[PDB]
Amino acid sequence: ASKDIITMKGDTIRVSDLYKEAKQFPSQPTNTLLQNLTFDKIFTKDFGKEVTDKDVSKKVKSIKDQYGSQFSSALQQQGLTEASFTPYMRTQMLEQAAIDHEIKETQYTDANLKKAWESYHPDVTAYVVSETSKDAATKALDAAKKDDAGKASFEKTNAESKVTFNSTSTSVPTEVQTAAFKLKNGEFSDVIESTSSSTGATSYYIVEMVKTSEKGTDMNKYKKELQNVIKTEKEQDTTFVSGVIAKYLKKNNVTVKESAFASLFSQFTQT
Amino acid sequence: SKDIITMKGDTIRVSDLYKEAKQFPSQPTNTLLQNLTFDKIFTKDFGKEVTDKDVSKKVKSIKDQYGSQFSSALQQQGLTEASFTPYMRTQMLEQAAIDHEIKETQYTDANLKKAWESYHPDVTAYVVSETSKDAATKALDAAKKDDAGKASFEKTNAESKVTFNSTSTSVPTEVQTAAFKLKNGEFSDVIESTSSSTGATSYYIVEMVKTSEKGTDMNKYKKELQNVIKTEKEQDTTFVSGVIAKYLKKNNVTVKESAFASLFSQFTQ
């Protein structure tokens, strides 16, 4: 007795196809095995020639080399083996090829460019110094604004804190950025207070502008920069990715024949 | 069309796995195989003792007690009302094997004596709990004052008159110890009991109505002591894991698909 579980254009997932995934990921549930096996097929039909076995094994090695000794425990946290990581990375790379392509061909619309432009600020170079105690930051600032001598001490002492950031920075906090975009070259800021949402600590920043900047009135001057702002946001927007999946599902007429898994792609057929 | 797991007179094939996959799409392949194996090995020896009617009957009696909470009670466990019946079936088949192993090997004289050293039979008495010590002190003085205050205590705390033994979970040890020293009609002092779980301190008052003694014959309370050994062994994870390991080894359970090789490593070591 032979029976199809999922139907799509030019292909179909059978029980044998499921059991093959079950043997490769005994820890993963049936639902996941089906979802991943479906994505693998629909994304291989349009981006397979762009993600060869060499492209996969090459990226896997570059990642293994960065994690180093932690790579083993990094795969356990995900519930994978070094052997099952290659095929897992293959499906993740095929799925990523589809989202990257969709972002590039449809998200850089005038409406999104203007949305990003409303709060955008170009690169500025300046000394951004963090302190734990408020009293410490207050004395360090008074010593820097005292005279040109104390200013050189601040610049020599906090030499590694001289950075280049824009409105998309993750290292420089929003309170600091706002106070910094108001400074003139050579000007110092007040003791900026910033409470971290991740940890929960309260740091005290001091900023000295070196090279400031203005976006101006022409948005087209920073069109490439704004496209990269839209790119980094869409990649992190779970709603957008689920939408990309829903598209390729609808495109290949993916249908669940086994009523037992009816709500298999319910997480995507809502976006 | 290939065999995944082999055992005596039977085998788990891919079709058998896909049938479980459709019943528990959220559970992983490993779990589907383990449960499907236990279901088969325990059904081979205790299936006639736990029929589908025995399962659906107990399931209904539980659904009726939880009432409206039953839905949210199954979510906390990660189950549906439909997947609860077959889950209860495997739990009952596995329990039939543990109960049978306990009955045929754990009611040894050595274990009966171990249970008997701290056993005490049923006693009927008024057990009243209080939050503040001063409240319990006044309630007691009012009861031991005269026969009038004694009737007030018995009328007001009428539903506190209970029957407990040394295996009670509701009456704390400090209270039990002070109660087994009372004679019929006698009141206890304000008993202080500190909970090991929370950390709160209650103040109990006990009035004996019908006391009892275990005596010198342990055989008189044989059934009670067997139930003491039974409730302990069911909760000894080492013993239960041993029971599983036995039925696995007994049916020569073997994983043929090397992909699941270490499937029962957690049970057979």
UniProtKB/Swiss-Prot annotation, chain B:
It is a lipid-anchor. One of its GO terms (molecular function) is peptidyl-prolyl cis-trans isomerase activity. GO terms for cellular component: plasma membrane. It catalyses: [protein]-peptidylproline (omega=180) = [protein]-peptidylproline (omega=0). PROSITE patterns: PROKAR_LIPOPROTEIN. Disulfide bonds: none annotated. It is found in: Cell membrane. GO terms for biological process: protein folding. Its EC number is 5.2.1.8. InterPro entries: Foldase_PrsA, PrsA_foldase, Trigger_fact/SurA_dom_sf. Keywords: Cell membrane, Isomerase, Lipoprotein, Membrane, Palmitate, Rotamase, Signal. The keyword Transport does not apply. The conserved PPIase motif is absent in this protein but it still has foldase activity. Plays a major role in protein secretion by helping the post-translocational extracellular folding of several secreted proteins. Belongs to the PrsA family. HAMAP family: Foldase_PrsA (MF_01145). This is Foldase protein PrsA. It comes from Lactococcus lactis subsp. lactis (strain IL1403).
